[PDB]
Amino acid sequence: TNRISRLKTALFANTREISLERALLYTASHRQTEGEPVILRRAKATAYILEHVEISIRDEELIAGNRTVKPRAGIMSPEMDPYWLLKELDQFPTRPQDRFAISEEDKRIYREELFPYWEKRSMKDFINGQMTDEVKAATNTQIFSINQTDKGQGHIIIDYPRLLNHGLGELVAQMQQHCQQQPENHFYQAALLLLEASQKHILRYAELAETMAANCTDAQRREELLTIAEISRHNAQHKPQTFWQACQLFWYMNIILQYESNASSLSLGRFDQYMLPFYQTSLTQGEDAAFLKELLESLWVKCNDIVLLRSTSSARYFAGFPTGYTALLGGLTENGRSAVNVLSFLCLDAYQSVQLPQPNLGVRTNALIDTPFLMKTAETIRFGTGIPQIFNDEVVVPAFLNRGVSLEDARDYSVVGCVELSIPGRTYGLHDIAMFNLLKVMEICLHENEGNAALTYEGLLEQIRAKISHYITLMVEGSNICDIGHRDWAPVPLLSSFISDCLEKGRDITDGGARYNFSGVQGIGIANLSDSLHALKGMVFEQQRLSFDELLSVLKANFATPEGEKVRARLINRFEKYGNDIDEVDNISAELLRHYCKEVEKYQNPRGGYFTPGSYTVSAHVPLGSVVGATPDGRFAGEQLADGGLSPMLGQDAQGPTAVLKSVSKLDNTLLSNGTLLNVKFTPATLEGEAGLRKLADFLRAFTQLKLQHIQFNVVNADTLREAQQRPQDYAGLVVRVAGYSAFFVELSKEIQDDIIRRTAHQL
């Protein structure tokens, strides 16, 4: 509809700005709460923000509530890390990734007020002081990186049924009982005051809407504002009844949760499941189905107001705003039957009207998925934004059962962020706490064996396994340090009050209140690792075309010599690559990634749970590849690693898209319980017509039966992407799939753009 087009346009009409507002309000509260327990200072800061932040209802909005009045603000968190903000203060409009405007006045405020206050007392300060010599040395080798040391943790889904099936009034009454039973418990005290502050913040909007209504001279908009006002008064206390009431309470708490956390991937869970009762009530009470769809389209637009601020180095790993308002559709019911419902379809139809990076919708596939929903899924994929992605119940549920998750909890899974498997309202997974550079481990092993006359292939392999094991230990150490930094500096009591089993245990998620406690660490580069070892085994040890030392010399020269460029061609073309259903190379990727997985699961986090392995990248395959020299798969020095996590390396998949599925199916995907990621690209031509949709639907059934965890699709011609590079001013709205998230192509750095362009465009 035209309103929806105008709401979308308004998000991008003005240049994104850095916002100091949360930091100034958070700091003002902090000045008044000196000497109080950290969790109460955190809560009172959120309450202070809720009472003082500037709010508006933007033109034609049907769902009230935005973090900032100006759209898509970069909300800075100097309480988490004030140092990078200071360094980049005069570089925000020009930095290579994620630009923002910032006024001269706000820069002065940052230099004069916020930086001096937070210097030496920030979370980054604590984490810096805890980082041990061995871990800092290990991050200097580029073998792994530790995430969220400088920002809110996020990466969690709250219990939406708890919120929507009770309403804030009953939740306050239950928290009052907890505080009465345990009057010394600061978590309960904090959660109560935040529930109460949430009510007042909702009533701030109720009062504003009622005022705006009287000052509105359009009769249709007046009625809309009066309804927003009435719904907001209802939201302050009552459990929702109608779809609009549920969506509005839902969105108010999501904004409020961003005030508490200011973090990525506060994901949405199984929206089509927990919203179904309210959609059904609205229909049976006679509301207009077209308005309900327009309301949902408007809610999708609301999700795109939120972009997270990160440093220039961080933006190399997480480029183009992977906000992670991820909602999954379909799946299984409690007894293992199909959960597809009318909202599963409507969510996809509303997305087809919006076609923005958010919500990051996913479809849960399984052996029961019906052809109409499969074809609606295929139809939506063909629009080319990358959404929806696909998750496979057939392997995700056993992966969770292996981690001690109950059958009913596992069947109720959803996804945090890009691809991180999680149990909604029941999990604190630290789902992207570290990324492990498998190819760098291999590269260091290679050069450690220069001049080793006794080297054999199997001995090299044992050295690689041993160095993987050694550095996993240090990853764990660094990850636990950041875990503790979030516990000591940044509890999230309101969020935690919506996470089982925090209220029962009486503890925030950062101190282990969640039912399930993981730490999720990503092994990246498996395609390059297996390709490299297979070509090296054949080139050097089997055929003896070069000695090992002669190969090392060619790598150090970056293949530049005349014989070097010819050795490179032989490595690339005369040895099989992962992603072509070739067992001899695929079995290397399976073996080495299983070794990674079995080592990771040995280690405990400080919350009474264990580390879990994943294999996904966001955009980190580019900076991780940028620190690995030339390798025996034919990579030049600095070249990206394979995209996504489980994808073949660029252009190496020569046997079609089903051969890719079969290679990935050989990995032990049940162990990779933190989630995995596979990118596949199709030409728009191969998907044309109903026959094109049926081909895609059949491909998705093949994917399901092969028990891969995840797949997602670009559908775009390389010519379009090159044209957007030449004339970005004509392609500001072009959306592409990066890795578990979608982004505006012209806002991605050249190296990510070329990643997407160079991925194989498959036919079906």
Q: Tell me how far apart the alpha carbons of residues 471 and 298 are, in angstroms, rounded to a whole number.
A: 47
Q: Tell me how far apart the alpha carbons of residues 527 and 210 are, in angstroms, rounded to a whole number.
A: 58
Strand-pair partners of 325: none
Q: Alpha-carbon torsion 160, 165, 170, 174, what sign?
A: negative
**In degrees rounded to 5, what are phi and psi of residue 516?**
-120, 130
Among 150, 146, 188, 193, residue whose Cα is nearest residue 46:
193
Judge contact between 609 and 515, C-beta under 8 A: no
Among 347, 363, 344, residue whose Cα is nearest residue 697:
363
Q: Alpha-carbon torsion 509, 512, 518, 522, what sign?
A: positive
Cα atoms found within 13 Å of the Cα of residue 184, Cβ hemisphere only: 0
Is 420 annotated as catalytic? Answer: yes
Q: Tell me how far apart the alpha carbons of residues 725 and 750 are, in angstroms, rounded to a whole number.
A: 8
3-state secondary structure string, 491-527? CCHHHHHCCCCHHHHCCCHHHCCCCEEEEEEEEECHH
Resolution (A): 1.8
Per-residue tokens: 524:
């990246």
The dihedral region occupied by 684, where left means phi > 0, alpha psi between -120 and 50, and beta the remainder, is alpha
Q: Tell me how far apart the alpha carbons of residues 45 and 35 are, in angstroms, rounded to a whole number.
A: 14
Per-residue tokens: 4:
């929806």
* H or E stretch at 188: helix 186-214
Among 514, 526, 698, 703, residue whose Cα is nearest residue 609:
514
Q: Which residues contact 621 (CB under 8 A, 6 or more apart)?
A: 524, 525, 640, 641, 642, 643, 644, 739, 755
Catalytic residue selected from 297, 420, 443, 751: 420
The count of residues in the chain is 764
**In degrees rounded to 5, what are phi and psi of residue 441?**
-55, -45
Cα atoms found within 13 Å of the Cα of residue 344, Cβ hemisphere only: 22
**What's the one-letter identity of residue 465?**
R
User: Which residue reads 């990579």 in tokens?
Assistant: 635
Per-residue tokens: 390:
């696909």
Distance in angstroms between the alpha carbons of the first and the last residue of the chain: 34
* H or E stretch at 691: helix 689-705
Q: Tell me how far apart the alpha carbons of residues 710 and 624 are, in angstroms, rounded to a whole number.
A: 22
Q: Tell me how far apart the alpha carbons of residues 144 and 596 are, in angstroms, rounded to a whole number.
A: 13
Q: In sequence order, what DSSP letters do the residues of 330-387 get, joined into one string?
A: E-B-TTSSB---HHHHHHHHHHHHH-SS-SEEEEEE-TT--HHHHHHHHHHHTTSS--
Determination technique used:
X-ray
* H or E stretch at 695: helix 689-705
SS3 of residue 446 by DSSP: helix
Q: Tell me how far apart the alpha carbons of residues 264 and 571 are, in angstroms, rounded to a whole number.
A: 40
Strand-pair partners of 269: 327
Tell me how far CA of residue 576 lies from CA of 411, 530, 588, 666, in angstroms. 38, 10, 12, 16
Catalytic residue selected from 247, 303, 347, 418: 418
**What's the one-letter identity of residue 511?**
D
Is 418 annotated as catalytic? Answer: yes
**In degrees rounded to 5, what are phi and psi of residue 569?**
-60, -35
